[PDB]
Amino acid sequence: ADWAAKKLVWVPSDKSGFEPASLKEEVGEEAIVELVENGKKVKVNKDDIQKMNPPKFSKVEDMAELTCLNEASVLHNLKERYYSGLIYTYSGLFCVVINPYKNLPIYSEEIVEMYKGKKRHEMPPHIYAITDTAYRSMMQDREDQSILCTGESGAGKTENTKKVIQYLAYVASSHKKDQGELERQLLQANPILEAFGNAKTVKNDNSSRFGKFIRINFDVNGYIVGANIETYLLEKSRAIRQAKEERTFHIFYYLLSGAGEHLKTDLLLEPYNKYRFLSNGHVTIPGQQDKDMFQETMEAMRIMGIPEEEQMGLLRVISGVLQLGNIVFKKERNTDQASMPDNTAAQKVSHLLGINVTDFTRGILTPRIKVGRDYVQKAQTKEQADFAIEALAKATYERMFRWLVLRINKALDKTKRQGASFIGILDIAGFEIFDLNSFEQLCINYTNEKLQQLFNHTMFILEQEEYQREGIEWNFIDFGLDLQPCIDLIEKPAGPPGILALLDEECWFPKATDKSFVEKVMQEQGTHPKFQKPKDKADFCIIHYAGKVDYKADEWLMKNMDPLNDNIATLLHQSSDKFVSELWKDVDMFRTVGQLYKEQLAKLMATLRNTNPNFVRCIIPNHEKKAGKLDPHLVLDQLRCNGVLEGIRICRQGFPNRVVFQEFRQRYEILTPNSIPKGFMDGKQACVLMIKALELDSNLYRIGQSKVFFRAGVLAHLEEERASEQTKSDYLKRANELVQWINDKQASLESRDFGDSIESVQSFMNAHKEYKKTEKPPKGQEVSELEAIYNSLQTKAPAGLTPNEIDSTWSALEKAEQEHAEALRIELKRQKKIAVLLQKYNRILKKLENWATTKSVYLGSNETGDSITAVQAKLKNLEAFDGECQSLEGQSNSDLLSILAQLTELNYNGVPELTERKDTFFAQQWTGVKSSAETYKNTLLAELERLQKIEDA
């Protein structure tokens, strides 16, 4: 919610690669940030901080749509998708896949149907979409396709290729068991090529040292007709020397430790510590046995259909390749001609390779060179003879490998249906950055530099097609040209000669050394943009797309030498061994590995530039093959190498976040509330009105036909202001509802109509106490939280809605509660005095009512008596009654007038009614008693007269 108020950024993290942090303060070139996780303040460099995407860009399916295009945002987007079960993620053209090390239900036959004919944006990212779009582009555009897969895992890349083939075997097959045979044979060709083409390096225990191009052939109607395997850029130099902790190709160790004693004898095999070509001896591969893998390799060849005598030819040549390194030449006394005092190694080489030892010895020591018309024998130094033997071993192993690829295609492409189109799957060793980068790493990084240039150009063509569809002017040079200077730094023959050209020149001079080669690179190429001096064992640095790479030019001269002895090549072409003769059937030296590498790569790049390229990036999540565990630095390292971040750099420089007109207006109209009329229909002009209301610089946006194209970070800022504006609306809406409640409650508390009853007044007390217990506290909390929101909103206001005005309005409410409760207590005391007076008033009357009634009953008897004294006795009680009434009359009337006077002080309504009730009683009841009292007295006198008359007689 309040994410825009935290100023969240990405800072480097040792544990998690990057982590969120709240930017607090900048001090010059450094910034103070607060780490979200533990709240500790650290100081970091401002150029180490990377912008963070808004939460709306959560688990985006295409990371080219991120508004903040950096490596910290790419890692975060990949991490969240991975832990949510999503291993596929598009990054522009790339299809990034992170190995889940699990069996996911995403490769079902029902999901294959959901991807047929669908576009990338219509479905979640998946290898099926890459395969479908490539297949549909093959049939619509009628041009061949290529799928370039990188990754440093023989398990992840192979499982991705298996999915590509399965999708093609389902969507383009005409007939099941026959529907998976193409995959069945390919899974048998993988171990065969692996033993001869893969090797343990200092960074990968099973690194493929060649490029595999699996072509799926199709007829003119789109049905699969067959498949074959092409290979490129075999690292043949690995056969003669390897770096520390590194092995040559697997097959050498399989044969040396996996062969029985009879095969050892027949192949003249020797222990590990007698072959110079095995630099480090029997380096083992963890969790694997060279002895055991030998059977599996031979097993796969039997399954493939390769006969016994052809497998023996491969083992025999392997033994011959090793024996060449055992030949020792020595410089003789005071003569530059090389000598070979011991011919034991040559006898074994000549026996294993089916040639004559004397022809071989004479052909390396004193070879014939055709001068004019005749063969002229020329001397050879020890160095020339050594390089010739090494070049012969490298060339033989390459010819043996290429023969094996042809032999496997003979099993695969058995029908040779010859299709009209193909989809090629390229599996090449990706970019390599070791602690010590040598000649091999330069050749590898040279290859991937041109492969990444194939990507940048492909993205350039497609992006140029998008801008023209939207009518937006295209003013960009080719994205592949950004990598051209680094490529020309390495490959350019002349003009500014490349590093490979400079190396060739040193290899052709006598006095030249490794130091003199570095001197020529420093002085002739230190001015190059992509060239840098190291800062320090390395000799020079190259700025690849994957960043700066340091190189050490140790032994580069000898590594670049590749002079094929045409004399020995003729001997091997004329070998008596039928297998060796087959390896050297196409034969016929200023010949270098670097120049031979350029041509091989040119053969590959020609193959690829004649196809439509697709790109899939396989990433290892962790080194423990665990599931659901992600190594952030391991992923970051691969992201820097595979060119994912290079594509992210490209669209970061252009307009990467394209937004449809109606979507842009719906999202950001809160920022532009009064610039679009109410009956406005043109959605394109509405965005023009919104952008004009935001003062966005014309360099930040491009208006298209259906979308508006924005630079990077533009949507990040608008999203920030959107959250900043909707939190303001939530404040104003809540502030109005709070003040209107306070005004209404105060207007209610100011009321003084508390009813005219004791139960009426006490009910409003219970309402006032229930208000202060249940209704008031929730509003008081709103006062505090709104003030907190306003102060937060003010750092990153209609009258009455500022915290200072709400605080005063709330105080007037508490003052209204003050007088309300006091007024109720005044009224409750008033209601009780009335009730007590009314009860005491009606008490006096009821006392007089029964007194007026009962005494009138006694008077009604008119008892005079029977004697004169008894009549006067009746007069005694009558005057007592008369004097008693005079006291009871004035006493009650005085108390009744007092109660009426007190009720007038309290402003009682029914005072005139009470006064009438008293005046009625005295005029009716009470005067009737006083009237009946005198009638009795007159009765007591009429009898008192006649009773005295009787006595006188």
Residue numbers in the entry: 24 to 198, 201 to 560, 564 to 616, 642 to 849, 860 to 1016
Copy out sentences from the published article reporting this entry, exactly as the authors wrote them:
Nonmuscle myosin 2A (NM2A) is the predominant myosin isoform in nonmuscle cells. Together with its paralogues NM2B and NM2C, NM2A enables tension and force generation, driving essential cellular processes such as membrane protrusion and retraction, directed migration, adhesion, and cytokinesis. pmcMyosins are molecular motors that convert ATP-derived chemical energy into mechanical force. The motor domain, which drives ATP hydrolysis, is composed of the N-terminal Src homology 3 (SH3)-like subdomain, the upper 50 kDa domain (U50), the lower 50 kDa domain (L50), and the converter.
Here, we present the crystal structure of the NM2A motor domain fused to an artificial lever arm in its nucleotide-free state, resolved to a resolution of up to 2.0 Å. The fusion construct, comprising the NM2A motor domain linked to the artificial lever arm, was produced in Spodoptera frugiperda (Sf9) cells, purified and used for crystal setups with commercial screens. Multiple conditions produced crystals, with one condition further optimized to the final condition consisting of 16% PEG3350 and 240 mM Na-thiocyanate. The resulting crystal belonged to the space group P212121 and diffracted to nearly 2.0 Å resolution. The final model includes the conserved myosin motor domain, which comprises the SH3 domain (SH3), upper 50 kDa domain (U50), lower 50 kDa domain (L50) and converter fused to the artificial lever arm. Since NM2A crystallized in its nucleotide-free state, neither ATP nor ADP was observed in the nucleotide binding pocket. The root mean square deviation (RMSD) between NM2A and NM2B is 1.77 Å, whereas the RMSD between NM2A and NM2C is significantly higher at 9.98 Å. This large disparity is primarily due to differences in nucleotide state, which influence the opening of the cleft between the L50 and U50 domains and lead to substantial translocation of the transducer region. We present the first high-resolution crystal structure of the NM2A motor domain, which demonstrates significant structural conservation with NM2B. Mapping of known MYH9-related disease mutation sites reveals that K373 is situated near actin-binding loops, optimally positioned to influence coupling between the actin and nucleotide binding sites.
